[PDB]
Amino acid sequence: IDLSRERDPNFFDNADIPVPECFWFMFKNNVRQDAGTCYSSWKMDMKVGPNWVHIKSDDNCNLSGDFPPGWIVLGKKRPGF
């Protein structure tokens, strides 16, 4: 998947809390489902189609998890972060 050709997520940076460093993009096969923001060097539980996935992010916004077949959540460091 070529993230360079993906439109940015439609996000709202909350002023009261630290700004999340990463964009995430969820796909089934080649098809974008949704996108958002998340923290680097962190963890979240996210529902990915029919399964919860525990997603870990590294310092560079690479996302790791046990994704169900055909699905992925891909991370990118935000510009300026």
């Binding site: 997520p9 439609n10 996000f11 709202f12 909350n14 009261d16 809390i17 630290p18 999340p20 974008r32 489902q33 949704d34 996108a35 958002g36 998340c38 923290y39 060097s41 962190w42 963890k43 979240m44 539980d45 996210m46 529902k47």
Partner: protein, 77 residues
Amino acid sequence: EMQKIVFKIPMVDDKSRTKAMSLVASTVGVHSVAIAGDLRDQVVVVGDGIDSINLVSALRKKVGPAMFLEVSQVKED
């Protein structure tokens, strides 16, 4: 510590987005709510002491068929 909860509420229209935000903002523990996402059906909730199961039930009863997308903690500085 501080909760981040994101729901997806499919099929929401603008009046239902407003209704959803009002409902969420009036809930114990909530600090903020925003609507985001590729379809404008992501409801991003941040707070502390939010009963998220009671909240999703209220959204389902009053707004639309809400589902959990994410549960996480805010990464504090």
